[PDB]
């Protein structure tokens, strides 16, 4: 069983330092690239940092560039994130996500359980049209979001990722390039798009399909998420 | 390597290549030898330091900071012409002959003749082992060395008879750049690993001499 | 003490006439041999072993040296009438190729030592750096040849015809003597020591084995060492002889001056044979090259 | 003794019937078709990373992914476009003689002298490649594994027999017997219902995967058959032998159509492959170069060359865009 | 006329006290690539040649008297 | 006696085959290679703008 | 008026049957021979400087 668990959250004062650990058990940790994604309260997901397999390539978000640091302990199957100075903006549910990159891979399949951190008191912009969509079961629903640049590379691949965050759970990958269904997701989900406009369709909607849908681009770092579309029933 | 995903794919490929080259480095300190010979000729009990590991059998004993890998091809019971080219790069050939078997001696000679003159093994030196001196020494007194070799004419002593068998095996060489390193072994011999080690080192010099252009 | 007076130089016709023939013959032989070696190595891409690359570079160096020989023969005939630019260029090319040839012989010796004595050990794997070693040798040759390019020009004198000499200023003689240390150290003594060490240990390890072709290898090694010595040692000894005489260590006299000049010219003629002989001693004495050359005749 | 006479007369009946069907040779009917000229093919990619002889190679169904097995004990999956290495699978036994790729891209079966067909799973949840199943039951060296589905594979061995396996259970569902020598190759028909196996008895015989019946046998070669491949329509196949000759046999006529022998060829054929159209018959030879034969006129329409050692495997993509060759010099080259 | 691989000073010893009545001509060579010292070579009327010390004022005096 | 019994049985099935003249078979193989001839990037070189390699 | 830096050597030929006038011939670094006027003090200065060299 693939399992990512994070610990180290809690209430800390501004200006202090905290360390978050993401221990992995159930997959070859030494071959996966691990990301840090944080979700501010009722605002949405946001990419933070990424370390490549073997600790070769390291990237940080512009918001916390030079302030955070990421380290990798392959023999211990643990991923760390040491934050130097914390403002009131750092409070969020930090997730731990694994990613493997090769021809035809799924680099955002599994998300960690997330830990809650509380602090006391150019880029590709992706926009989602709406924020709440009421619908009844059995009715097809279409979700669409745009982007600044054209995500269609010259290689023919479009780098768009669709995630679903059920209430009280962690985001789950559904479509990882434009229309490639993830592993274990129901076949009713389907995706399309053309360069800068993309659509996600859910035929024969079921009761468990409710939640917040996020569309993300992987064309170029830093990674940017959408506003977030919520399905209501 | 323009896209962000393709940049990591190139990083994965380069990480794979590093382990591929690293494994090749660790695969250059071992000597690959080939075991041949008739059945019940001691081809599985040459060195008492076995450390073995139906089909192909490997043996990976080490000696003097050098790794010796012995491949036993017996038991395949198929046509040798189709899989003997896999061992084209072995350092040497180890041949085991039982001197007490007067009926399989002609069978062993056919095996040696075919292997020595094979097109793939035209340059691989052969380390020939003549086993069971004591058993042969007692056998010759009871039965002279004439039923197996009617052409024998010299004295019936052990020294001439054993050397006569050795001459027949080396008469099948018929090739240059190949040297046959013989040795007489018995059941209670422990220095078989030493004999193999000096022969292998001697074979490497001959190949290195040709590569360096000295010969 | 009226005995003191200028030592007039003396020139002969026989040496002039014969040296041209010798140089032309050596040029032809070296050109043919180097062409054959390069053709054999380049025609087939199978079996491109380290010694193949070493021999290719040695052949290129010898080819350039032979290509430069004829202008030098003309200069010996009539003196350097060909200006300054050609003096600089040709001296540069000659010295660069000479240094590279010597250092390549030393490198081949090192390779043989690594491949025979240390055959069983883990150090031998360091013999797969032919490319970088050869590049380093060529770069070192170009670095060592700089003094020739910086301080060479024609010198016009009354007693002697123009010569492509060196012009370092008021104290040019002493500076020339000091610069002569490089050809006799990085060109003779260091490569000689390396070759002697490597081949001595190679012989020691060969004599103790039981290989079939050991004797031929030992004879080949002896032949290579003796050929190198006979080709280069006389010129170096005469150049010292000359250095010592200039350093007043040995008495200086006009007869000694003429004798040393003749010896220098003769030893230069003799040492020029190395370019022609190398293809035979190092390459054609091998079975692989001969078989390949016979094959290419198709 | 009486049945021996019955065996002989049955051969005579087949030969007379086979000869009566022959009215005109293949090279006599298509004598008015214009030649294809010179097929000059240039090396587009050079795949390096193997440190030993390459013995097998198979193309992915998407014509982008490759697989190659070598004596070094490594199993490498290549990205044929950008020359990257997707996977590197360490084998248990370094003596691998054949190596196959699944039609769905999920699995890879790749085995050899260890008498075991090892099947590896690529799309695992743990991120690594694991040995899903090891098939055993053959007493001789293995050759020409070929996937039928994700749970069904046909294998050939030196036991003079081929086998049909079930990957899930692991038991030998069907066994095909009838050869009198080591079986060196097999190829699966496009309709995935028949296959032909070339053995060392200088005979290739058509077998039924569903019934396990030797429907027909084909003769004519003077030496052992080393490779085999169907015509793209699944009505004919071409074989390569140590006789340095290639032959084209028709399943419906039960007779060879034409031979692809050249006077300058001495060494035998190692691999046989067809183009997407069924006009260029590519064959690998032991003299380090591959030849392109016009399958209708037996004319050498160019030579690939380039390799330094014996070419041990050939491969043409499903879309026919490129040809991959492997040799004992530890290099894969992609031609177009 | 002649070819020499290397150049040397035209004089070895240094004589003084030549009589101008015998001198026919004088040659002066500054220190160049040929040699490390200034050389004065006087050719007499009888065809003999002599070498003069540059540091000798008399030589200097003889040279200037010639001029 | 029990080994060659199946041998004649196999030859019995191999003899009862509905065979077709090679003249018709040769034409059929010629038609296929001529029909699917425009879709062969090896027989006819592909344009450089449509060459993935 | 030849510059000092270009003068390699100076030869002074006294009067004789073949010439009644003193000659000064300067051999330059470039090999060309030039004639100098003996009466010019510059020649004497050049000779003196060369000797002091």
Give one DSSP letter per residue of G1-53, joined into a string: ---GGGEEEEEEE--BTTBSS-EEEEEETTS-EEEE-TT-HHHHHHHHHHHH-
The whole-angstrom distance between G50's CA and the closest CA on chain E is: 6
The whole-angstrom distance between E65's CA and the closest CA on chain C is: 22
Q: How is domain E23-66 classified at the architecture level of CATH?
A: Beta Barrel (2.40)
Segments of chain B assigned E as strands: 30-37, 57-59, 62-63, 66-72, 92-98, 126-131, 180-184
CA nearest neighbour of E54 among E36, E45, E44, C132: E36
Q: Which residues of A touch B11 (CB under 8 A)?
A: 52-53, 56-57, 101
SS3 C182: helix
Beta strand pairing call for A10-12 and A115-119: parallel
Domain co-membership, A110 together with A145: no
Enumerate residues 6+ apart whose C-beta is below 8 A from C230: C270
Preceding omega of A85 cis (within 30 degrees of 0): no
Chain B 38-77, residues with CB within 8 Å of chain D CB atoms: 54-56, 76-77
Stretch (H or E) spanning C155: strand C152-155
Beta strand pairing call for A78-83 and A160-165: unpaired
CB contact under 8 A, F36 and D33: no
User: What is the distance between the alpha carbons of residues A215 and A226, in angstroms, rounded to a whole number?
Assistant: 5
List the structure tokens of A110: 């599994």
- The answer to whether E23 faces chain G, any CB pair under 8 Å, is yes
Enumerate residues 6+ apart whose C-beta is below 8 A from D98: D55, D56, D69, D110, D111, D112, D142, D143, D144, D145
What is the CATH classification number for the domain harbouring F12?
A: 4.10.260.10
Stretch (H or E) spanning D184: strand D183-188
SS3 B91: coil
Contact D250, D25 (CB under 8 A): no
The whole-angstrom distance between D51's CA and the closest CA on chain F is: 25
CB contact under 8 A, G11 and E25: yes
- The answer to whether A100 faces chain D, any CB pair under 8 Å, is yes
User: What is the distance between the alpha carbons of residues A210 and A166, in angstroms, rounded to a whole number?
Assistant: 7
The answer to whether residue C57 sits within a structural domain is yes
Residue found by looking up tokens 């350093």 in the block = C247
Stretch (H or E) spanning B107: helix B105-116
- Give the CA dihedral A200, A203, A209, A210, nearest 10 degrees: 70
User: What is the distance between the alpha carbons of residues A54 and B199, in angstroms, rounded to a whole number?
Assistant: 44
Contact B118, B163 (CB under 8 A): no
With both helix axes pointing from N to C terminus, report the angle between G41-52 and E57-66 in degrees, rounded to the nearest 10. 160
Burial label, A15 (beta-carbon count in 10 A; 0-12, 13-18, 19+) = exposed
Asked if chain G contacts chain C via 3 or more Cβ pairs within 8 Å, the reply is: yes
What is the CATH classification number for the domain harbouring C213?
A: 1.20.1070.10
Question: How many domains does chain C fold into?
Answer: 1
Nearest CA in chain D to A33: D127
The CATH code that applies to domain G1-38 is 2.40.50.40
Domain boundary among A72, A97, A119: A119
User: What is the distance between the alpha carbons of residues B72 and B37, in angstroms, rounded to a whole number?
Assistant: 10
User: What is the distance between the alpha carbons of residues B90 and B120, in angstroms, rounded to a whole number?
Assistant: 10
Residue found by looking up tokens 């350092």 in the block = B91
Domain that holds residue F13: 1-53
Q: Which residues of C touch E50 (CB under 8 A)?
A: 2, 4-5
CA-based torsion, D47, D51, D57, D61: positive or negative: negative
The whole-angstrom distance between E47's CA and the closest CA on chain G is: 14
CA nearest neighbour of F42 among D219, D316, A124: D316
Enumerate residues 6+ apart whose C-beta is below 8 A from C295: C44
Enumerate neighbours of C (3 or more CB pairs within 8 A): B, D, E, G
Q: Which residues of C touch D308 (CB under 8 A)?
A: 45-46
Domain boundary among A72, A93, A119: A119
User: What is the distance between the alpha carbons of residues A216 and A108, in angstroms, rounded to a whole number?
Assistant: 11
Please state the length of chain B.
215
Beta strand pairing call for D280-285 and D290-294: antiparallel
- The answer to whether B6 faces chain A, any CB pair under 8 Å, is yes
Domain that holds residue A33: 3-119
The whole-angstrom distance between C47's CA and the closest CA on chain D is: 9
Contact B38, B104 (CB under 8 A): yes
Domains of chain B in sequence order: 30-199 (3.40.50.300)
CA nearest neighbour of C44 among C239, C292, C262: C292
User: What is the distance between the alpha carbons of residues A108 and C239, in angstroms, rounded to a whole number?
Assistant: 77
Domain co-membership, A140 together with A216: yes
Rounded to whole angstroms, what are the CA distances from D201 to B79, B85, D218, D219, D254?
12, 20, 11, 9, 18
User: What is the distance between the alpha carbons of residues D164 and E52, in angstroms, rounded to a whole number?
Assistant: 112
What is the CATH classification number for the domain harbouring A220?
A: 2.60.40.10
- The answer to whether B83 faces chain D, any CB pair under 8 Å, is yes
SS3 D39: coil
Domain boundary among A119, A152, A179: A119
Burial label, C10 (beta-carbon count in 10 A; 0-12, 13-18, 19+) = exposed
Contact B15, A54 (CB under 8 A): yes
Q: What is the CA radius of gyration of chain D?
A: 20
Question: How many domains does chain D fold into?
Answer: 1
Q: What is the CA radius of gyration of chain C?
A: 21
Q: Which residues of A touch D126 (CB under 8 A)?
A: 2, 26-28
User: What is the distance between the alpha carbons of residues A50 and A60, in angstroms, rounded to a whole number?
Assistant: 7
- The answer to whether G37 faces chain E, any CB pair under 8 Å, is no
User: What is the distance between the alpha carbons of residues B119 and B115, in angstroms, rounded to a whole number?
Assistant: 9
CB contact under 8 A, C206 and B212: no
Enumerate residues 6+ apart whose C-beta is below 8 A from C12: none
User: CA B64, B65, B69: angle at the middle one, nearest 5?
Assistant: 90
Beta strand pairing call for D236-241 and D246-250: antiparallel
Please state the length of chain A.
233
């Amino acid at each position: 069983d693939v399992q990512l668990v994070e610990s180290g959250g809690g209430l800390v004062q501004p200006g202090g330092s905290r360390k978050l650990s993401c221990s992995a058990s159930g997959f070859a940790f030494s071959s996966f690239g691990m990301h840090w994604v944080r979700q501010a309260p009722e605002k949405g997901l946001e990419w933070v940092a990424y370390i490549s397999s073997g600790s070769g390539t390291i990237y940080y978000a512009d918001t916390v560039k030079g302030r955070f640091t990421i380290s990798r302990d392959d023999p211990k199957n643990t991923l760390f994130l040491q934050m130097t100075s914390l403002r009131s903006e750092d409070t969020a549910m930090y997730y731990c996500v694994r990613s493997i990159y090769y021809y035809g891979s799924s680099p955002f399949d599994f998300w960690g359980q997330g830990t809650t951190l509380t602090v006391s008191s150019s880029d590709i912009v992706m926009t989602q049209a709406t924020s709440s969509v009421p619908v009844t079961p059995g009715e097809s629903v279409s979700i669409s979001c745009r982007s600044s640049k054209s995500l269609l590379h010259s290689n023919g691949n479009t780098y768009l990722y669709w995630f679903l965050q059920r209430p009280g759970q962690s985001p789950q990958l559904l479509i990882y390039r434009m229309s490639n269904l993830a592993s274990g997701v129901p076949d009713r989900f389907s995706g399309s798009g053309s360069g800068t406009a993309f659509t996600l369709t859910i035929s024969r909607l079921e009761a468990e399909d409710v939640g917040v849908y996020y569309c993300m681009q992987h064309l170029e770092y830093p990674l940017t998420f959408g506003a977030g579309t919520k399905l209501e029933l | 390597t323009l896209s962000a995903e393709e940049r990591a794919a190139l990083e994965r490929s380069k990480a794979i290549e590093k382990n591929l080259k690293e494994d090749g480095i660790s695969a250059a300190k071992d000597v690959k030898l080939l075991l041949l010979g008739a059945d019940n000729s001691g081809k599985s009990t040459i060195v008492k330091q076995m450390k073995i590991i139906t089909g192909i059998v490997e043996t990976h004993f080490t000696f003097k900071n050098l790794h010796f890998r012995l491949f036993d091809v017996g038991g395949q019971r198929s046509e040798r012409k189709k899989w003997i080219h896999c061992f084209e790069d072995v350092t040497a050939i180890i041949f085991c002959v039982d001197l007490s078997d007067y009926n399989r001696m002609h069978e062993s000679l056919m095996l040696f003749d075919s292997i020595c003159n094979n097109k793939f093994f035209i340059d691989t030196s052969i380390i020939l082992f003549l086993n069971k001196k004591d058993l042969f020494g007692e056998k010759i007194k009871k039965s002279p060395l004439t039923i197996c070799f009617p052409e024998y004419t010299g004295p019936n002593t052990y020294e001439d008879a054993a050397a006569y068998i050795q001459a027949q095996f080396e008469s099948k060489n018929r090739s240059p750049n190949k040297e046959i390193y013989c040795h007489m072994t018995c059941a209670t011999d422990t220095n078989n690993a030493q004999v193999i080690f000096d022969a292998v080192t001697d074979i490497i010099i001959a190949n290195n001499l040709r590569g360096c252009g000295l010969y | 003490l009226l005995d003191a007076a200028p030592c007039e130089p003396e020139s002969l016709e026989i040496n002039k006439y014969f040296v041209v023939i010798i140089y032309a013959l050596v040029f032809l032989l070296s050109l043919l041999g180097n062409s054959l070696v390069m053709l054999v190595i380049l025609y087939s891409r199978v079996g491109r072993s380290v010694t193949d690359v070493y021999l290719l570079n040695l052949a290129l160096a010898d080819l350039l040296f032979a290509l430069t020989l004829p202008i030098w023969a003309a200069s010996k005939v009539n003196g350097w009438i060909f200006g300054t630019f050609l003096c600089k260029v040709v001296s540069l090319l000659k010295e660069v190729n000479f240094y590279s040839g010597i250092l390549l012989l030393a490198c081949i010796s090192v390779d043989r030592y690594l491949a025979i004595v240390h055959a069983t050990r883990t150090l031998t794997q360091k013999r797969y750096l032919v490319k970088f070693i050869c590049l380093s040798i060529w770069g070192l040759s170009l670095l060592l040849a700089l003094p020739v390019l910086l301080f060479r020009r024609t010198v016009y004198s009354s007693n002697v015809s123009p010569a492509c000499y060196e012009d370092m200023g008021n104290n040019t003689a002493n500076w020339r003597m000091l610069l002569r240390i490089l050809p006799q150290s990085f060109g003779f003594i260091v490569p000689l020591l390396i070759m002697l060490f490597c081949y001595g240990f190679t012989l020691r390890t060969l004599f103790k084995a039981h290989m079939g072709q050991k004797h031929r290898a030992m004879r080949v090694i002896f032949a290579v060492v003796l050929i190198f010595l006979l080709c280069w040692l006389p010129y170096n000894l005469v150049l010292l002889a000359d250095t010592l005489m200039r350093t007043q260590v040995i008495q200086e006299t006009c007869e000694r001056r003429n004798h040393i000049d003749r010896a220098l010219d003769a030893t230069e003629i003799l040492g020029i044979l190395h370019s022609c002989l190398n293809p035979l001693i190092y390459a054609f004495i091998g079975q692989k090259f001969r078989h390949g050359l016979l094959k290419i005749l198709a | 003794d009486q049945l021996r006479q019955e065996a002989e007369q049955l051969k005579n009946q087949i030969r007379d019937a086979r000869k009566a069907c022959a009215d005109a040779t293949l090279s006599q009917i298509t004598n008015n078709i214009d030649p294809v000229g010179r097929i000059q093919m240039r090396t587009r990619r050079t795949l390096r990373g193997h440190l030993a002889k390459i013995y097998a190679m198979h193309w992915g169904t998407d014509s982008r992914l490759l697989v190659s097995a070598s004596q070094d004990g490594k199993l490498i999956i290549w990205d044929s476009y950008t020359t990257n290495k997707v996977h590197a699978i360490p084998l248990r036994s370094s003596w691998v003689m054949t190596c196959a790729y699944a039609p769905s891209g999920n699995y890879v079966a790749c085995g050899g002298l260890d008498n075991i067909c090892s099947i590896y799973n690529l799309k695992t949840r743990e991120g690594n490649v694991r040995v899903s199943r090891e098939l055993a039951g053959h007493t001789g060296y293995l050759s020409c594994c070929r996937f039928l589905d994700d749970n069904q594979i046909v294998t050939s061995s030196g036991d003079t027999t081929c086998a049909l396996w079930d990957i899930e259970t692991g038991q030998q569902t069907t066994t095909f017997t009838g050869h009198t020598g080591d079986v060196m190759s097999l190829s699966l028909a496009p309709d995935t219902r028949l296959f032909v196996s070339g053995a060392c008895d200088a005979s290739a015989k058509l077998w039924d995967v569903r019934e396990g019946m030797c429907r027909q046998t084909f003769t004519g070669h003077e030496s052992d058959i080393n490779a085999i491949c169907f015509f793209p329509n699944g009505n004919a196949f071409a074989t390569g032998s140590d006789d340095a000759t290639c032959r084209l046999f028709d399943l419906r006529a039960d007779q060879e159509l034409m031979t692809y022998s050249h006077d300058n060829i001495i060494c035998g054929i190692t691999s046989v492959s067809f183009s997407k159209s069924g006009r260029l018959l590519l064959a690998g030879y032991d003299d380090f170069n591959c030849n392109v034969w016009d399958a209708l006129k037996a004319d050498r329409a160019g030579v690939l060359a380039g390799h330094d050692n014996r070419v041990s495997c050939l491969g043409v993509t499903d879309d026919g865009m490129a040809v991959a060759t492997g040799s004992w010099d530890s290099f894969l080259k992609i031609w177009n | 006329a002649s070819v020499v691989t290397e150049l040397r000073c035209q004089c070895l010893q240094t004589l003084q006290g030549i009589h101008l009545k015998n001198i026919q001509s004088v040659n002066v060579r500054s220190p160049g690539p040929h040699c490390a010292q200034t050389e004065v070579i006087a050719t007499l009327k009888n065809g003999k040649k002599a070498c003069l010390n540059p540091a000798s004022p008399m030589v200097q005096k003889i040279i200037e008297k010639i001029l | 006696i029990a080994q060659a019994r199946k041998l004649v049985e196999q030859l019995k099935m191999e003899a009862n085959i509905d065979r077709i003249k090679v003249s018709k078979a040769a034409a059929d193989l010629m038609a296929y290679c001529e029909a699917h001839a425009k879709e062969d990037p090896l027989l006819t070189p592909v344009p450089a703008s449509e060459n993935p390699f």
